Amino acid sequence: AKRTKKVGITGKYGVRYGSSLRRQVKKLEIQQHARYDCSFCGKKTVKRGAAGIWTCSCCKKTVAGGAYTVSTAAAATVRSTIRRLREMVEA
Amino acid sequence: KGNAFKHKRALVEHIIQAKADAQREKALNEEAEARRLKNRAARDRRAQRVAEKRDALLKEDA
Amino acid sequence: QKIAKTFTVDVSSPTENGVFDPASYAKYLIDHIKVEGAVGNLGNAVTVTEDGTVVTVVSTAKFSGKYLKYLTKKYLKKNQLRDWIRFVSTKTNEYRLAFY
RNA sequence: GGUGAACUAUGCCUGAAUAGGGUGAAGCCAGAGGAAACUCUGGUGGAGGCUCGUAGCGGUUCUGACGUGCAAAUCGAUCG
RNA sequence: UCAAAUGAGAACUUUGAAGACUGAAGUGGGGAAAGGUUCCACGUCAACAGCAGUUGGACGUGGGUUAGUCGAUCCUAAGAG
RNA sequence: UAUGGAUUCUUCACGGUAACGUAACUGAAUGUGGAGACGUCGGCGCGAGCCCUGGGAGGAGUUAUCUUUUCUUCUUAACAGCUUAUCACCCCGGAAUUGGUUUAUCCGGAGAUGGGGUCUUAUGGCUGGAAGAGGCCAGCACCUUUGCUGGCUCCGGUGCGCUUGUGACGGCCCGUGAAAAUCCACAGGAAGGAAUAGUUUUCAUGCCAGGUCGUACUGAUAACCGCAGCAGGUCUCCAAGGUGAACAGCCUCUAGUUGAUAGAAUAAUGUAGAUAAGGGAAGUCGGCAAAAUAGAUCCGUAACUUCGGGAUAAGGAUUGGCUCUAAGGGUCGGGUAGUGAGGGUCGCUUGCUACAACGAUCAACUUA
């Protein structure tokens, strides 16, 4: 059945800290502990080796990314911006 | 996997369920349709046991 | 299959001095052989082939000559004839007596 | 004008050590209800600068013994 | 704890005869530093072994560690110059 | 250095579809990879040893009574040859009814299932080595040197058992976990080679040669140091059985000890223990001190909470011996057709028949 109520995966910590602290950082765990897609085979193996290291075995890719997600939206807009401004300078 | 079962002999009684319901339910469906047929036709002589109100009027005057 | 097992023991060694009755020892066993639970439960599986000089038991029951040694030890304890006889092995299931 | 980081304080490089318990974190499944959202229920599963607690490691206390001691810092109980 | 022997000597030297302990995360087996002939065989007891000591790691003497194949020196680490 | 083979005018092998494979089947500079060469923790599986036990045999004790009794022997090095794995790889295949499948959730049309095969040999097994060894007894022979003379060294089982090495997962890190030393193999076709020889001889066999040191012992309440033959300190490794969850306790066996100036009486005195009617902190600055509890099994639980705690909250019930009962697993099947893939035998539905609900057997300690 359902194991924990609201503590979830940080139930390993239990009643240990200021609860604001556990309340913020449990989300950060959820971020850095997701698996993402290889866009070249279609599957998903991408996951944090380190903060900005986004490892992948399905078709064997690894991208230096953000910290806890792979790509930040800053990389998305400098992406769309070096690319789009590349379509404003190259185009 | 989930839990859904007690132990070996209990699951053997469950094998008697899978056996018992494959056999005793599948053959039940087959004999069900096999018994529907031509009691269909008894209902045909029934619906022609009170609408031959229409069969006692019309065609064979010649 | 049902082969009677042969156990070959010379008992002549004090009897030749006349100081021993092997009919008293085979009599001592013929009520006492622990076959099928009861000692002396000896319905026609056995042979008691004594001589006065050499006793040999050819018996299709569960037996070992080491248990025959265990039959000697209570005997020579009982009549207390220990320390004039060793139940010596010639070879396997082959034994003999002494007189000293 | 000479000597000590062997004691002691600190760094680096190569090496070694740590019963038996409580704890059930996450994962995943089985069921039920709900239109879904979800809601329970039954599990799996084995988290914790977690805990008892042994080896361990220190020493809080009785103000214990000693108090020319086994002892220039011992021994008893006790504790962490 | 008892008998024997041995010696002028037997509390303390042997042998038998007993009872106990550690009890195996051993009073077990050892090994590293450390010590260094203590090791081992004999003659002996000045003196020590706080009574004793006939005994010792005591005194006088001897004997004892074997390598193509096992560690050193190779390498490099911390480091040195 | 010889020998034999090799591999060749296809100058310096064969085959398999690929799996991959061998006794073979040249090579400068430049690279190349690999090894060395390195985090922790968790489960899980497997190797090895140990422990436990049966039968068979040889050795020994018990015995008023029982006691097939309590113990004892039953070994195989480096090294050779065979065998042997997770994993991996190639054909066939196209899958949704999705299937395959972990203990714990993973995979498959970028081919799953599945059906075929190819492969590392960890590992373990077999045999040799290596039985003669060793051992075990058993018998004589006598100063007997003690010599002779036999036999045995067999088959088990068992495990949440112990100790240890593996496999493959899983955890964790704003922590992501040595260096050189060394040796390949492939490019490279440098350069060199057969044609009557040619030869690397990574294919075999066949010659000789193996500095220097260290090595005995203690390793500790006498071989270390503490001033001491000082109750102080001094790094590393191995664990029998009962008992118990336990390396906890306690006993027992091996291993090893059995050493502490002696003697006689028992007065206060302390020291080290215990015991106390009744009352219970008044005593004491002050419950110091002391007393009380406790394991397991079932019940129950307050406040507060930062939700996780609190909580074992608190607080309730149980614990001999015997004779019984229940559940909790594994191997084999389901024949009058003389039957299958054969064509002493031979097996499914098995009542050259072609193939359709169960029963026979071995095994636990687990709760009730």
Side-chain angles (χ1 to χ4, degrees), chain C residues 12-47:
Chain C
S12 65
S13 297
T15 312
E16 71 205 10
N17 306 102
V19 301
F20 173 63
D21 185 63
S24 175
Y25 185 70
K27 178 64 206 70
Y28 177 85
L29 256 63
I30 204 165
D31 48 358
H32 295 161
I33 298 166
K34 196 177 290 192
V35 165
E36 194 192 7
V39 297
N41 189 4
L42 297 176
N44 65 14
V46 309
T47 65

Side-chain angles (χ1 to χ4, degrees), chain B:
Chain B
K1 180 191 187 300
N3 196 354
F5 293 100
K6 178 184 184 293
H7 79 101
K8 186 184 73 64
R9 173 193 62 190
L11 197 145
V12 170
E13 307 156 14
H14 181 269
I15 295 165
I16 302 164
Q17 305 307 313
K19 170 252 289 184
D21 299 333
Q23 294 164 351
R24 292 162 177 86
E25 297 301 320
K26 187 176 294 298
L28 188 146
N29 310 125
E30 300 158 356
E31 68 196 9
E33 183 178 1
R35 286 174 281 105
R36 291 171 60 191
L37 266 297
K38 298 302 290 181
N39 208 162
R40 298 181 183 181
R43 189 172 292 171
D44 181 75
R45 295 179 175 183
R46 166 182 295 172
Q48 307 304 316
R49 169 62 59 106
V50 72
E52 302 193 356
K53 181 166 292 179
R54 197 170 179 178
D55 296 340
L57 296 170
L58 296 176
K59 183 177 178 180
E60 288 181 352
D61 197 2

Side-chain angles (χ1 to χ4, degrees), chain A residues 4-56:
Chain A
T4 51
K5 176 255 189 70
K6 74 171 81 162
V7 287
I9 189 162
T10 187
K12 54 185 285 177
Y13 285 89
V15 201
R16 272 100 52 82
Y17 280 155
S19 62
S20 303
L21 313 171
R22 72 189 85 179
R23 186 165 66 249
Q24 195 269 323
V25 180
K26 180 183 172 182
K27 184 184 188 296
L28 305 171
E29 308 165 351
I30 298 161
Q31 302 158 5
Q32 66 176 0
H33 292 163
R35 185 181 292 173
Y36 316 97
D37 297 332
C38 174
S39 298
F40 307 97
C41 63
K43 290 175 283 294
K44 54 189 294 292
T45 44
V46 185
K47 199 181 287 286
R48 181 182 178 274
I53 288 169
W54 293 98
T55 66
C56 185

